[PDB]
Amino acid sequence: TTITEELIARLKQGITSGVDLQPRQVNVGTVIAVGDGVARLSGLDQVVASEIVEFPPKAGRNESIYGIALNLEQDSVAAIILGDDETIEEGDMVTSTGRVISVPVGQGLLGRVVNPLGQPIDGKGPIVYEKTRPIERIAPGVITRKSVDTPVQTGIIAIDALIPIGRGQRELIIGDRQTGKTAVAIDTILNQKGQGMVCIYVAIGQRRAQVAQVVGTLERFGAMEYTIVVSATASESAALQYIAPYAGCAMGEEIMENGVMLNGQLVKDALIVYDDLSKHAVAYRQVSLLLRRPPGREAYPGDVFYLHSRLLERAARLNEEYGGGSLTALPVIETQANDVSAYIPTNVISITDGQIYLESDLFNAGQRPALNVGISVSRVGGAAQTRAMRAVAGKLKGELAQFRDLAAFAQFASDLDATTKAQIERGQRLQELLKQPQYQPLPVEDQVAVLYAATNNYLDDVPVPLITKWRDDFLAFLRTAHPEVRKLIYDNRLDRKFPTPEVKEALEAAIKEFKATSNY
Amino acid sequence: ARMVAMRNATNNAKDLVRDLTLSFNKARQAAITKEVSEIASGAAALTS
Amino acid sequence: MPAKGVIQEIIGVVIRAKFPEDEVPEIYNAIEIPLGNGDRLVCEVQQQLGNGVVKAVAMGSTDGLRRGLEVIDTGRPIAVPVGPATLGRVFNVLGDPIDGMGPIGPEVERRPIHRDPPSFEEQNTQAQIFETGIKVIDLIAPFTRGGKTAIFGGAGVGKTVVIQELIANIAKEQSGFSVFAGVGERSREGNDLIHEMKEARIDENTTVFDKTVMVFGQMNEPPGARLRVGLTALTMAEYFRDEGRDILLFIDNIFRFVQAGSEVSSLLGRMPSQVGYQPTLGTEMGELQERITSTKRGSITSMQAVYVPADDYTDPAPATVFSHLDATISLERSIAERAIFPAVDPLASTSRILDPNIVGEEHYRVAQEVKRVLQRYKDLKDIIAILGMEELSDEDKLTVQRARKIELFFSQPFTVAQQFTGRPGKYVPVKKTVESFARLLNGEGDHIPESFFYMQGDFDDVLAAYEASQK
Amino acid sequence: MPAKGVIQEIIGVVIRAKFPEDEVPEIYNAIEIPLGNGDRLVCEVQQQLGNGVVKAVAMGSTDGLRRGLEVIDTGRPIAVPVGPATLGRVFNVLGDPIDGMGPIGPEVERRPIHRDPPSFEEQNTQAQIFETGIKVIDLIAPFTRGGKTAIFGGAGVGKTVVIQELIANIAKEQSGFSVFAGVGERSREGNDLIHEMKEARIDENTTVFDKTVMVFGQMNEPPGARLRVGLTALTMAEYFRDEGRDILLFIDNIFRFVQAGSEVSSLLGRMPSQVGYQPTLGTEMGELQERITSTKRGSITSMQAVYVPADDYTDPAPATVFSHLDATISLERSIAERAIFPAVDPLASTSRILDPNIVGEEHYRVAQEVKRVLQRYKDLKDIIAILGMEELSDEDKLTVQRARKIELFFSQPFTVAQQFTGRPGKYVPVKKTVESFARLLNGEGDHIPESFFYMQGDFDDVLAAYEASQK
Numbered sequence A: 001t002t003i004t005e006e007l008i009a010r011l012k013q014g015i016t017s018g019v020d021l022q023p024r025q026v027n028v029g030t031v032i033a034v035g036d037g038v039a040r041l042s043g044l045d046q047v048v049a050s051e052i053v054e055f056p057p058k059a060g061r062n063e064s065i066y067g068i069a070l071n072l073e074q075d076s077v078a079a080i081i082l083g084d085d086e087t088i089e090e091g092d093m094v095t096s097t098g099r100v101i102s103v104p105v106g107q108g109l110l111g112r113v114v115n116p117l118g119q120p121i122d123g124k125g126p127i128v129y130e131k132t133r134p135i136e137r138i139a140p141g142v143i144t145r146k147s148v149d150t151p152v153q154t155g156i157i158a159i160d161a162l163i164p165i166g167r168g169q170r171e172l173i174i175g176d177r178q179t180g181k182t183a184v185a186i187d188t189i190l191n192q193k194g195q196g197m198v199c200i201y202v203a204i205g206q207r208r209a210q211v212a213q214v215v216g217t218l219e220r221f222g223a224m225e226y227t228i229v230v231s232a233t234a235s236e237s238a239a240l241q242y243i244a245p246y247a248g249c250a251m252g253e254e255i256m257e258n259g260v261m262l263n264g265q266l267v268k269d270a271l272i273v274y275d276d277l278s279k280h281a282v283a284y285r286q287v288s289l290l291l292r293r294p295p296g297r298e299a300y301p302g303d304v305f306y307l308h309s310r311l312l313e314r315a316a317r318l319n320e321e322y323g324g325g326s327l328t329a330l331p332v333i334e335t336q337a338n339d340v341s342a343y344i345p346t347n348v349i350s351i352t353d354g355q356i357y358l359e360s361d362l363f364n365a366g367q368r369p370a371l372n373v374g375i376s377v378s379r380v381g382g383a384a385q386t387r388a389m390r391a392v393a394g395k396l397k398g399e400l401a402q403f404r405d406l407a408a409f410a411q412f413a414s415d416l417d418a419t420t421k422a423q424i425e426r427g428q429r430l431q432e433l434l435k436q437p438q439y440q441p442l443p444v445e446d447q448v449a450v451l452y453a454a455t456n457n458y459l460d461d462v463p464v465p466l467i468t469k470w471r472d473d474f475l476a477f478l479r480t481a482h483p484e485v486r487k488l489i490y491d492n493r494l495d496r497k498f499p500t501p502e503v504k505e506a507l508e509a510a511i512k513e514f515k516a517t518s519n520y
Numbered sequence B: 001a002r003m004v005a006m007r008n009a010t011n012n013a014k015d016l017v018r019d020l021t022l023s024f025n026k027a028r029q030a031a032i033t034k035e036v037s038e039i040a041s042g043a044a045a046l047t048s
Numbered sequence C, D: 001m002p003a004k005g006v007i008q009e010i011i012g013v014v015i016r017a018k019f020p021e022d023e024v025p026e027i028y029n030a031i032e033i034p035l036g037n038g039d040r041l042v043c044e045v046q047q048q049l050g051n052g053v054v055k056a057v058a059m060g061s062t063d064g065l066r067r068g069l070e071v072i073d074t075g076r077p078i079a080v081p082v083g084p085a086t087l088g089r090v091f092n093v094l095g096d097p098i099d100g101m102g103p104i105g106p107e108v109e110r111r112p113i114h115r116d117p118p119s120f121e122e123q124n125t126q127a128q129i130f131e132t133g134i135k136v137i138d139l140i141a142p143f144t145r146g147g148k149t150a151i152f153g154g155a156g157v158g159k160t161v162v163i164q165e166l167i168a169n170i171a172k173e174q175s176g177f178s179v180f181a182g183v184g185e186r187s188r189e190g191n192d193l194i195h196e197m198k199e200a201r202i203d204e205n206t207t208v209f210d211k212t213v214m215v216f217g218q219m220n221e222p223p224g225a226r227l228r229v230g231l232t233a234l235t236m237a238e239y240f241r242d243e244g245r246d247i248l249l250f251i252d253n254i255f256r257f258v259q260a261g262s263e264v265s266s267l268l269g270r271m272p273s274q275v276g277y278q279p280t281l282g283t284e285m286g287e288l289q290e291r292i293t294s295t296k297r298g299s300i301t302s303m304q305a306v307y308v309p310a311d312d313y314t315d316p317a318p319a320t321v322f323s324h325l326d327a328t329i330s331l332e333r334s335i336a337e338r339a340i341f342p343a344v345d346p347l348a349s350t351s352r353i354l355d356p357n358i359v360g361e362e363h364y365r366v367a368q369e370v371k372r373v374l375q376r377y378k379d380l381k382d383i384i385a386i387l388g389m390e391e392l393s394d395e396d397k398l399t400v401q402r403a404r405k406i407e408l409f410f411s412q413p414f415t416v417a418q419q420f421t422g423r424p425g426k427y428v429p430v431k432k433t434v435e436s437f438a439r440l441l442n443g444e445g446d447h448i449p450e451s452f453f454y455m456q457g458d459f460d461d462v463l464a465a466y467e468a469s470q471k
């Protein structure tokens, strides 16, 4: 037999006696009012809440614009238009699809820029998929989760040493205007090149040009081999911006529950960045106010803490019974003049496990990552760190706290006693060490080596303005003259007593060899 | 003399910071109350 | 009341149900919408909008519900199981066990969420100290039986660690139960970590988890659930209160209870009050924290954790919480950075029971003098850091030495929680704290260096370690 | 004439008109009300209320209207002329020429106001620097081709003068055309002082006015006209973008666009958002800004003036535009009052294109070092306010002198500033300004005093002035 005979055998079953030619009185709705992206439907009693409605094509319109039936009022259905509101007119037919919003999920979404509905916008062909995951679902729950132990290496020394982020931890990045929140998120995404983690970037309410630049940065560093870029831009309707982070986290939950083949290895760890939850909350506030829902504080609806919480509580770290996968959330919040006590910032701060505060004062002062160590917290803490980083960064944290206690004396250090001047100089060198260039993440072994050199008395000779350069040069040294030291540090990074005499002596020899042959 | 005068100035500055923080908290609470009252007035005058 | 209605409106987590003209559900009557199989959505009726229409909050996903769905009135508020069957179990707002174990069963007594507080005759006229084991808590800001204590602090100062070590202390050393209301509980912070901590603390053949009830109103739940979880835990604790036991209810964040109430009121269309808060903030706080009293039969002491918005203690939520508080325990990040796990600020922790005629005459002399010495140290700390201890005269060097000794002496290892700096269990009583601090306050500790007082015991452990090291 | 309805309600600048149920106008359609003078009033539909009733924003006086007036639906949104016929003319929100010239003929193409922005795959990520004639704009916050750039300042700092100076510079020294959107345009700034200032000869017989398009949504216009004038100018510029030409778009004010949106939303009965602003603020701003992009075919590159009241950058008008910017020029009144009329603050004036990979390594190095020396001078001027410069300085004299020379050298005489001063305008290429600042940065200008750097072009002009004085 021929394979085409098998193909015909697949047919001639639904072809002959597999179609029901029964006409049935399907219940459709007629549009009675169209607002500013909100359309009201007269009778659609066979619709569920948050169901996607169709608006089938009519004369002069060859495409169907879907909506989300949000307000199921008595003899009225107010649905927010996902597409453009101009085409929908009074009296238009609306057919209930019978489905909640679902997005394609799986391996096919890897390196593709997609709509919140899953439709590609990168122009690289249709998305290949076989499974669709619902937009909204309950969080994994109580017994499903596990304590966060595996670290997420962002590549930033300050974050990876002082504000640890683990797999399954919701770590907010909260800042103001241009402080590098997207820079921190992109640096975290770029550092997962071989860490067995799939990244997702949502970009709610941004420019098309900004998302294009982000995608270009990701694909010029090879990060699109494992990254999914959802996109609901500023010109798109508020419904798409409202459903974008849920589509992203649906894809992330597909990665968490099932996993995908990345570099030939099964990966069940996902890192998702909601690049603007402030813009997502603004879009949902517009949706609620256009639906005439009662406003609250700052005109946000009552269920706006609920809004984000459903989104963020889905980021979990499952136990081995439920697969062992994890979903790591990196929400981004933009404050106004550092108003941390605003509504959405307090909501996301309360929801998330830890916070990463970025200050414009530090950004304009030369601190390349504008990270405020004093107020930023990660309540997971040392459990989200390697044993090497746990052993090394404790003294860094203590010295930085001591320097922050004495930061008012920095310009006066030449007039103080020996110990206070020593503490001030150590703090200045450590702060200069944390400055990192954009798009240059560091591996955990490099961070551990640099922080071991700084923690011990080795950067006292080199002056402050050269500390950063020293670090770079030292890394180049470790990248060229001593690969075995880096491999040794990476090999026993999980040892409970990390500074074993072997790795300790190797690192000390490398530091001494670099310092003796270099001048600053 | 400079040490004592600057210690007194620091204490007075801390007291002024405390008073200004109380004033700022009052101002912030009043601003949010005014905002929510205006929003409720503008919403209830057109819906119910 | 087996009345069946139909869903009329669905707007977010606020639904409307049309019933017959008679047998309309009352306020807080817990209507139920079947969703197929055994799943159901339990809403709580909030208003009666005319001819058979009731407006209710969803307390659930409500993302797949159509209009016209059947709604069953229960005839009573949300019914949660009460009794010994609730010990060692984790519940949601509706009393459904959210742990791996099965359902509670129909033979277990169920009680409504919305009860009345104890009457005027049932209240205890005379207050009484509640011994908790912690040195700084029992000395500086002592608990009161049937009273409210609020713990403050930063994001990671260790409030939850203090809560769970108090749960362990109540469960192990004394045969008493406790109920933990995780209002706004993160599904990572409490829904697995606290269970692991309570199942790790073991006395004999049973865990601390086995002597506590847990009601988790997780953050992913709609505002009605997080609003009613506190009252659910109150209902589950009032059973043991009715048996004459001394329950110590814990509340993870009473401010999140306030925020849930505010969100519910905003969703119902009510006019906002104060700083965008609900108009019924005072009554909503009263309906919860007036059930936490010292009845003549039994008692419910409670310990809330309060989040102060923008560090504004005059904010309406802390203002209404403070009206019901009997004691405060302030945690500071500065004390935490000095590796002091019980980071209690004795100069910022207060208690109404700190009176000579209630907690003891020596209590309100030792605590007063300890606070005076610590205030003297706080005054002299800037001078010491700027100039040095050589400028300090007599009666000030000794005061600073004693103040440092007590400040380092307030620390406890919390050996019940995990085994960090583990040592034989002490559970220092109130009288032992009074005697130890009177001993150190009257000298008798000046020869001890200011490094031995760390995770110590009752100042007899201090001298024991001093003799062991070098004597 | 697809449909004819009747006016039901006239409330200020809001018209409710009843149409046949099968011929109701679309959402953004334009409806004409014929008046008894041969003219018409064009209203823009905004909503479809119930059965055949539409709510529309007036875009006119509505002081001659009565109930029951005939209203003709146009079937499509407001159509404005596009093409060379619009070049050298002055229009309004409706596309009608408001200058003294004749009406636009019916043979020209008319395009709808509301158009979808270019798709994601049409975005040209290749960042290219757009050469402006301004020294400080070129060096500190370079103008991005195809990007959106903003100017921030108070009142009278020089935003409009800077905008018209870029119009004159890029039309004279470059072949780039320009489209001007006078959103909320003052009738003194728009009807004069820009028409006259665009009567600057380009080569022999063509003025800058003849190569530019102007659309004035004046201040006396109703809020809908000021809301849609920006989209009118965008529609006019999109024709030149679609022809492959790199078009320039100047939105003379952004906060007036936000004010018009807020007024329109308040008049329509929409629920207020934030501090009484419109709920669709972000969506309206995105709809305006996302059409200004660099595509494969052409590129709209824009400069948009924003007025910050006092120093409040957290107001909704500048806050909603920050997400759409590639560069910000922060004008300061302090610099303006120091006779540095191009009052750009080199500090707090950022740009995404200021990267060594885009503008070159020399440009980045020169700009960064200029910002560094100005930042050092920001403290050294305070230091020398009390301790004279001659008293003590470790290279501080040299860096103070260099910083004063460069902050005077940032000042440039404008072509349109001849009325204010009389000094003829100067145009500096982007290469010449970075070369001049590199030359002045390390020596070569330490002997020329800080008087020949005031109003000059490149460093060669400063030299020529110096050796002209020393004759």
Ligand SMILES: Nc1ncnc2c1ncn2[C@@H]1O[C@H](COP(=O)(O)OP(=O)(O)OP(=O)(O)O)[C@@H](O)[C@H]1O
Binding pocket: A175, A176, A177, A178, A179, A180, A181, A182, A183, A184, A334, A368, A369, A436, A437, A438, D322, D323, D352
């Ligand atoms: N570590 C860094 N070192 C140097 N420059 C940096 C660094 N991080 C960011 N930048 C620069 O600052 C700019 C602003 O950063 P970024 O866009 O990430 O901030 P943001 O908070 O996301 O701002 P936006 O509100 O514009 O989205 C970047 O485009 C880049 O030029």
Ligand SMILES: Nc1ncnc2c1ncn2[C@@H]1O[C@H](COP(=O)(O)OP(=O)(O)O)[C@@H](O)[C@H]1O
Binding pocket: D153, D154, D155, D156, D157, D158, D159, D160, D161, D162, D189, D307, D341, D342, D413, D414, D417, D420, D421
């Ligand atoms: N390049 C310049 N040369 C001289 N004067 C200027 C210049 N730019 C602005 N001015 C002064 O500013 C005024 C115009 O400011 P304008 O730009 O209209 O204010 P705004 O920036 O608020 O629009 C003029 O009266 C003029 O005196």
Ligand SMILES: [Mg+2]
Binding pocket: A181, A182
């Ligand atoms: Mg960003």
Ligand SMILES: [Mg+2]
Binding pocket: D159, D160, D189
């Ligand atoms: Mg102007």
